[PDB]
Design a protein around this ligand. Sequence first.
Ligand SMILES: Cc1cc2nc3c(=O)[nH]c(=O)nc-3n(C[C@H](O)[C@H](O)[C@H](O)COP(=O)(O)OP(=O)(O)OC[C@H]3O[C@@H](n4cnc5c(N)ncnc54)[C@H](O)[C@@H]3O)c2cc1C
Ligand SMILES: Cc1cc2nc3c(=O)[nH]c(=O)nc-3n(C[C@H](O)[C@H](O)[C@H](O)COP(=O)(O)OP(=O)(O)OC[C@H]3O[C@@H](n4cnc5c(N)ncnc54)[C@H](O)[C@@H]3O)c2cc1C
Lengths: 442, 442
Amino acid sequence: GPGSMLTYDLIVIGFGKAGKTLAGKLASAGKKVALVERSKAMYGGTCINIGCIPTKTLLVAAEKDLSFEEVIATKNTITGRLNGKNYTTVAGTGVDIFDAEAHFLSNKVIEIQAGDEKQELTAETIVINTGAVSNVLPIPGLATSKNVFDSTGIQSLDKLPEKLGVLGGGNIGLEFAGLYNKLGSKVTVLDTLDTFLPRAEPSIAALAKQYLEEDGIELLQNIHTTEIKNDGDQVLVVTEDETYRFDALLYATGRKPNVEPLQLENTDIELTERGAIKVDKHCQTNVPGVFAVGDVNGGLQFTYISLDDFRVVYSYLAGDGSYTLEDRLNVPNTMFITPALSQVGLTESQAADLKLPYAVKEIPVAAMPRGHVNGDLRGAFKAVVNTETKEILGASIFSEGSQEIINIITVAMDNKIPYTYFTKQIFTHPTLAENLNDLFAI
Amino acid sequence: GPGSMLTYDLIVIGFGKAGKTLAGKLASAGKKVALVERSKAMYGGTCINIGCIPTKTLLVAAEKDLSFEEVIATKNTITGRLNGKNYTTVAGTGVDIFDAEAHFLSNKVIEIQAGDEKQELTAETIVINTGAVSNVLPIPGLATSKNVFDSTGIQSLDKLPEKLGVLGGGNIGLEFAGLYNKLGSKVTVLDTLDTFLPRAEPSIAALAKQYLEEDGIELLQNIHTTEIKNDGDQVLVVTEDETYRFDALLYATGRKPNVEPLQLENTDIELTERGAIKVDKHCQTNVPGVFAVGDVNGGLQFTYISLDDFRVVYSYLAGDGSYTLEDRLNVPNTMFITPALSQVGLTESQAADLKLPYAVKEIPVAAMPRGHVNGDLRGAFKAVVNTETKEILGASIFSEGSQEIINIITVAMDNKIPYTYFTKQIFTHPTLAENLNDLFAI
Ligand SMILES: Cc1cc2nc3c(=O)[nH]c(=O)nc-3n(C[C@H](O)[C@H](O)[C@H](O)COP(=O)(O)OP(=O)(O)OC[C@H]3O[C@@H](n4cnc5c(N)ncnc54)[C@H](O)[C@@H]3O)c2cc1C
Ligand SMILES: Cc1cc2nc3c(=O)[nH]c(=O)nc-3n(C[C@H](O)[C@H](O)[C@H](O)COP(=O)(O)OP(=O)(O)OC[C@H]3O[C@@H](n4cnc5c(N)ncnc54)[C@H](O)[C@@H]3O)c2cc1C
């Protein structure tokens, strides 16, 4: 028969980054903790299974002597191991992991299916960590044509598509274009926008466009699609001036908070106008003791932002609440094209818009000895500084290893270190990082 | 006939790092500057032509689909271009570059051969930047046997040696062992010392030994050589218990200040007991206005230390002398085995010896998601901190990209940032650097 409602100190909904971190921390401290996750293919969350880890594992594998099928299998081995490592690490702290989709019956009661019965759970603290789901554009035929995939489906194709279309121009789409180009596909990116990489420094965007085109990718702007349909197994993308034909189509046009399954109408929890779970500076909803962390609260969609939401909630629950969303320091980013394009802080354009007293300096990797050592002259560094306060406003690092190097910048920005320090730092040599000695001699 | 003595504001002896930097800086500012360099194969100095740049260029090339001869030619292309880039950048500032070996006639007069005549030059400031030369052990037969090379000769072998011996166990020897092993040689390292990598953390040295042996290198300790001789073209290294046979032998047992050619007996300039040019905190000799920078002053032998000696001398000549050798901050190092082994600050053993209130933490790369993404689980991170002051005392980063990552640590050590900051920094993901969030949760 059915069980009586189970009471925990904390319930986490979703095996996301903030949630699994908070759950294990409090279970290790002796609290009674439950974590509810709808899919065994998602133990450890989006980054482990469908996001950060498989995407970058596929790109590393594609540079090696492996067939398409071997690259896919390598990705499955790596994500499968981390999936099991995450389940077992969380359960090993004492967290009770439930395999079900949770929905709310009231502010702090959830229901799950548990075999032939429903089971209810409650707690004093509920942390909603349900992530996001792919946007699907309302283009007629997109959702019903064969060989059309989102960013998850594209990771499990049966064979290499000879021609791959990508609809959208963000980090995700461009990383997959780079991947499939390496694997051997003829790749065309179709973007509605006029400007390629409009958030990047223009000089850096121009280099990126050059390198992607050199590598054989076709980058199209101002593309307005009226319909998607099939011709046999192939996909036709019908646009104003041309119909494009592909063996597979990826769409990558954003992801939105995953809130529908929760049945929030059964609670007092408020959504934002855009559909995210609304939170205050402590990631708390308007219901006391109910929080929302990671992508579902509408914040920046990176695993490291979900991790920092754990720091905010843990500060409020276990500490004195002194670290809040209003205190968050600098947030870098990387897009793993070839080479990686990394950035932190303000661009020149952003500093100009704020009327700050700024200066910039740019050095191409082609002028750097380590670029010659590497046999790879792609990329550039660009720094943006405030000539009055001596603060570093931002930097772009587009180069081999930039996903590591960018974090050098963040240490100095977070700690209010003047930009002139980088002219004095003693760097290892030969490296790309030592060129920061020259980039900051402004 | 002969020319009258030429007068400059500054004479630099040797195309080293500090010297070429100072020469171009002051010539660009309108001073009259001469730089005297004995070998056109050395324009740009040791790192460009025989040191940092060819060694690391050979290691990158050896990972690619290139024959031995193609790897050597690639190295020659890269160093040749940087040699010409350095000559032309320095001459383009207005420096007069003389192709000769300089020696002193008195404290601030040098003589060079200039065609069929001698030429004298003088200045108010002389900067001696003559670098170092390879040590050659007094082993009978070492200096007279065929197929025995120092670190320069080993970069120009006629063909791959099937078996390569390396005598000595520093960064230089081990990097060349790694290189020739990749290229296909059977490599044996013969070290007199009992302990492998005695300056590294022991756990890190043990991993390095494991990986080098996995890769096929033989690492021998406590080897005392009594003679080197030839058998035909092969080299025999006669040691107490065994005679080793190789197709070529590298010796790499250190480099010493290159002072003999200068004829310093014709000046008042003092040497240290070990034979370096003695300097004060401003890199100044006991003769006012004569300085010694880089390896020749006995300091740490890295290009980035020679660069920092430029900062010291420039502070004294052009500024207020407020930055001195006594003010130098933290100096990292990398040894480019596979993967690179980087370090900065104190080891655990060094902190223990100083009786500091320290704690340590170590995380293997095998426990880090990016190691799995990379398909490379080699290496580890180790942090050493002061639990009272919260300062970072030191770190070891042995991993892919560690030569970039180590510089993250230096920013925090130089700026007195507490180690707990690294638990809060928002790093890019997936990367090896983000694991600093966990390494510093001590
Ligand atoms: C293709 C791609 C590439 C990316 N690349 C990077 C990158 O390089 N770097 C980076 O930092 N970020 C990257 N991201 C973003 C990053 O993956 C996400 O921002 C982050 O993982 C989201 O974490 P989260 O904590 O919000 O929750 P998630 O990790 O999304 O977890 C939510 C969990 O909730 C579960 N769930 C949902 N609803 C319910 C319910 N009602 N009941 C039970 N379980 C439920 C889901 O099954 C899921 O496991 C990438 C994302 C994608 C898709
Ligand atoms: C194999 C090897 C690998 C190395 N790897 C690295 C590394 O990865 N990273 C690192 O930072 N360091 C490394 N080093 C060390 C680094 O190369 C040296 O520490 C640094 O380059 C020395 O610079 P310097 O300014 O002292 O002068 P140098 O660059 O040594 O220049 C001295 C110049 O003086 C000239 N000269 C000498 N006497 C006279 C004279 N009487 N008249 C005229 N000219 C003269 C020489 O021809 C030479 O060009 C390496 C060294 C070697 C040999």
